[PDB]
Design a protein around this ligand. Structure first.
Ligand SMILES: [Zn+2]
Lengths: 208, 122, 138, 151, 99
RNA sequence: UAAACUCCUGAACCCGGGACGAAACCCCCGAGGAGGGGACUGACGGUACCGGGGUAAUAGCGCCGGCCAACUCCGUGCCAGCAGCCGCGGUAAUACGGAGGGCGCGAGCGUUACCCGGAUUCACUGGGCGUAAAGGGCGUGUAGGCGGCCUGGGGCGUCCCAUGUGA
RNA sequence: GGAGCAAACCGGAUUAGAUACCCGGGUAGUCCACGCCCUAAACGAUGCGCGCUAGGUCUCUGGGUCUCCUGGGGGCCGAAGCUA
């Protein structure tokens, strides 16, 4: 399943702020903020010129952690992209961004993406009036993502939607906090994303 | 060669042969020992090894390296051949399988237990 | 006996270029014309003409080259980079229209032989007719 | 002021009664990542002082590359006598697939999508050089219809 | 339709039968070259009219015997001893092969 | 941030409801036809699903010298042993064995076996043969293979359209 | 058939040993006919035939009123190119 074990110890390994931490990573510590160096008994020690496989690998792992997803699933959603006509770089991320657990985070429903997952996998989250607790659901254009009636008044969501007030989020998503309803306008282009990742390395690393 | 030589004689095919007569191309073949004995290794190195000859199901008879620290294979003890060559020892292209049959696992080991039929402690 | 008249020409040409010769002859042929008539239509040469040598039909091929270069070895870039024969006399090669080759991504021509006549590549899918691939040129 | 990455720094050893003194091999690449690239190969008993020379020979030997929307202008094979190199154009989002060596060359060329392979020998030093004669022979359309014109 | 092949008689040494040999050039399924291959068929000649050297058109017919599944349709051109040799010349070669 | 600690969520389980798959044969009017009508039938199964209630609730495996990414301590001392290749072990081992930690991957992770790949190392695409493996000791010649310039008919090869097949 | 040379063979010396090097002698063989043998660093270690791609110089040979061209054959040097 998910990475369960410490997740703000990769925050370090990469050296790239991974806000898999809710309020934390923003605050004066994504851990990384306090310790900006690699984990372990070494880490803080003259770095070593990474190999091609490395840099590629590492740029490739950096991606998977952010979406907190199975490597089975990850790869198997990469192939899915390769096949379809279009640029594989962007398109790859598109599929990713059509994850029901992701659409949640990206819309703001849940504070982390680790929370955007459980909140779906607890039936808290519905689509088009019908419940869907499968974290993988591929969001199609137009689908109304939203919470159920059993959650309208739950501590957590009412402190996120409280913190979702108007503040723009996602150039491809309409969000109505008033009624707690969100919509997936369209598949996302590239410029709409800006993850600290090179989609032009990943494609490479997957040639071995 | 000219394409016309190819129409005629034609390109020749490789045909590879197995470095493991395990029969049935079987990933493992049961066998009982006949004699467990220590043998010194080859050119660049030296260390009295622990090996044994295993009479097979197929009426065969082969020598297979017993890896790991210490073993309890005597004479009439059955064992599972894993097939794999040890460069140190000339003419041994088979591995005894630990944690299987009369060949117990390894005593006290903790790292790589799967590669040695060793149960995880408590 | 001269095995393949057609590859000899492309070689006469090939060789004629490496030494940068203004002209080089090759025995006549109502077919060989159908080749040169193309290499000129596509600016690989200034053209040609049928000449008279000792009472024999020949074809002078006026060659073209780039400008003199700057620096080490003022060798001018070749106007005829490449001129290899694909369909050989020992190994004939015929292509259907639905598979005509593209020489060096569009910049190259694949002069071939078809029923409609002797044609280039784009001119072969223009009339949508395939044939025997004479040779590729760039 | 450009960009730098060395492919290897070998330890060549020579003979002389008593012992064996050594120099070094330093192959490097430089490229603004937008059409200008430079490979270099220097030598010096010092490992750093080597790549530092290679870097100067780099900025020296240059070559504009006819990048086509991030890729090659047309495929080419080029034999550098001992080693064979193959370059192909690729649609967007293909990536730099090549030996680690010619990769550096292209990734510094500004190349983003490419198909390549190394036939025959695979000596770094030579492959490099081939790849370099490769690019120094690429022909964009205009560069073509200009020659085949001569008006 | 009843398959038909053009060929050349190469034996009327049989009672009302003939040995028709037909070559069949065809592009090799790997090396392009157009390589000719040849087969022998036996045709039912009830009128004992078709002699040696004959070039004929034979038609896929209702079986006449063990290996007689073709009848000769019509002649093409008589005097053709030239081709017939080509076959009989290859015959004499087999001798100088064994040991 | 890992842990404890706080809060919330609530797999498991509990009760309640509970199928789709199943409309035809059958029957009346009509005529035993068309059509309209009326009636039975479910192994899976009291399962899926739905509603309510609801507890923080297994981690494992390979590796960490180079290829190949992840290093230190300790023991051992060409011993014990690792190994796919090059090789490591003879007091300082990131290669043997524990541990610390770390890289990969996760209900899998390794291993063996076999298949293609890499092997462009049988090469049509795509290799070669002066010394690296490789020109027949040298000729004549059979079958075969290959074949100059021109006009014409045929149109086998070849090319093309339609069409039948290509379940 | 057998003069000369000459494996083997004996002898002299050398050498620790010397079936070898060196020397004196020595038979098959080397030569002829007829037959068989069919091997090789049978080497240019480069199959053959044809067209193409600067020249310089030496030699062998054939033709042409010739300090020169024109064919053929044997060498060296080097345009381009080829090559690890
Ligand atoms: Zn963090």
């Amino acid at each position: 399943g998910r990475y369960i074990g410490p997740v703000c110890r990769l925050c370090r390994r990469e050296g790239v702020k991974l806000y898999l931490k809710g309020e934390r990573c923003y605050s004066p510590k994504c851990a990384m903020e306090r310790r900006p160096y690699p984990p372990g008994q070494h880490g803080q020690k003259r770095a070593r010129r990474p190999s091609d496989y490395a840099v590629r690998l590492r740029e490739k792992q950096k991606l998977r952690r952010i979406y907190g997803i199975s490597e089975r699933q990850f790869r198997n959603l990469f192939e899915e992209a390769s096949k379809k006509k279009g640029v594989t770089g962007s398109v790859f991320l598109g599929l990713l961004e059509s994850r029901l657990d992701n659409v949640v985070y990206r819309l703001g429903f849940a504070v982390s993406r680790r929370q955007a997952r459980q909140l779906v996998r607890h039936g808290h989250i519905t689509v088009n009036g019908r419940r869907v607790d499968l974290p993988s659901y591929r969001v199609r254009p137009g689908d109304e993502i939203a919470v159920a009636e059993k959650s309208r008044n739950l501590e957590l969501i009412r402190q996120n939607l409280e913190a979702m007030k108007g503040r723009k989020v996602g150039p491809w998503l309409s969000l109505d906090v008033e009624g707690m309803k969100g919509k997936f306008l369209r598949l996302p282009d590239r410029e709409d994303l800006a993850l600290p990742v090179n989609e032009q390395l990943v494609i490479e690393f997957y040639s071995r | 060669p000219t394409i016309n030589q190819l129409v005629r004689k034609g390109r020749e095919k490789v045909r590879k042969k197995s470095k493991v007569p395990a029969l049935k191309g079987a990933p493992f073949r049961r066998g009982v020992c006949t004699v467990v004995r220590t043998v010194t290794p080859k050119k660049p190195n030296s260390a009295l090894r622990k090996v044994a000859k295993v009479r097979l199901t197929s009426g065969y008879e082969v020598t297979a390296y017993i890896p790991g620290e210490g073993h309890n294979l005597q004479e009439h003890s059955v064992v599972l051949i894993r097939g794999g060559r040890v460069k140190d020892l000339p003419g041994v292209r088979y591995h005894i399988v630990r944690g299987v049959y009369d060949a117990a696992g390894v005593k006290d080991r903790k790292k790589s237990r799967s590669k040695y039929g060793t149960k995880k402690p408590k | 006996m001269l095995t393949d008249p057609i590859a000899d020409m492309l070689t006469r040409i090939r060789n004629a270029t490496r030494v940068y010769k203004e002209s080089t002859d090759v025995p006549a042929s109502r077919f060989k014309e159908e080749i040169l008539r193309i290499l000129a239509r596509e600016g690989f040469i200034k053209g040609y003409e049928r000449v008279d040598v000792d009472g024999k039909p020949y074809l002078r091929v006026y060659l073209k080259y780039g400008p003199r270069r700057q620096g080490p070895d003022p060798r001018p870039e070749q106007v005829i980079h490449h001129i290899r024969r694909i369909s050989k006399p020992g190994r004939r090669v015929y292509v259907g229209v639905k598979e005509i080759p593209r020489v060096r991504r569009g910049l190259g021509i694949a002069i071939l032989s078809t029923s409609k006549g002797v044609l280039t590549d784009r001119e072969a899918r223009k009339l949508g007719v395939g044939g025997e691939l004479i040779c590729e040129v760039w | 002021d450009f960009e730098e990455k060395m492919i290897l720094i070998r330890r060549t050893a020579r003979m002389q009664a008593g012992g064996r003194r050594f120099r070094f091999g330093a192959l490097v690449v430089v490229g603004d990542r937008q059409g200008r690239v430079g490979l270099g190969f220097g030598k010096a008993p010092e490992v750093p002082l080597a790549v530092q020379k290679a870097g100067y020979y780099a900025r020296r030997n240059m070559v504009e590359v006819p990048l086509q929307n991030g890729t090659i202008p047309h495929e080419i094979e080029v034999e550098f006598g001992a080693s064979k190199i193959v370059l192909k154009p690729a649609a967007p989002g293909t990536g730099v697939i090549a030996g680690a060596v010619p990769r550096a060359i292209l990734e510094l060329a500004g190349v983003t999508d490419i198909l390549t392979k190394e036939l025959g020998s695979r000596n770094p030093i030579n492959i490099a050089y081939a790849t370099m004669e490769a690019l120094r022979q690429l022909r964009t359309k205009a560069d073509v219809e200009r020659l085949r014109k001569g008006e | 339709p009843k398959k038909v092949l053009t060929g050349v008689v190469v034996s009327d040494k049989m009672q009302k039968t003939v040995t028709v040999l037909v070559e069949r050039q065809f592009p090799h399924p790997l090396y392009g070259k157009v390589i000719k291959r040849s087969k022998k068929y036996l045709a039912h000649d009830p009128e004992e009219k078709y002699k040696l050297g004959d070039v004929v058109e034979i038609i896929e017919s209702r079986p006449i015997s063990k290996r007689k599944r073709f009848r000769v349709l019509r002649l093409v051109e008589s005097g053709r001893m030239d081709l017939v040799e080509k076959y009989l010349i290859r015959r004499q070669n087999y001798q100088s092969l064994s040991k």
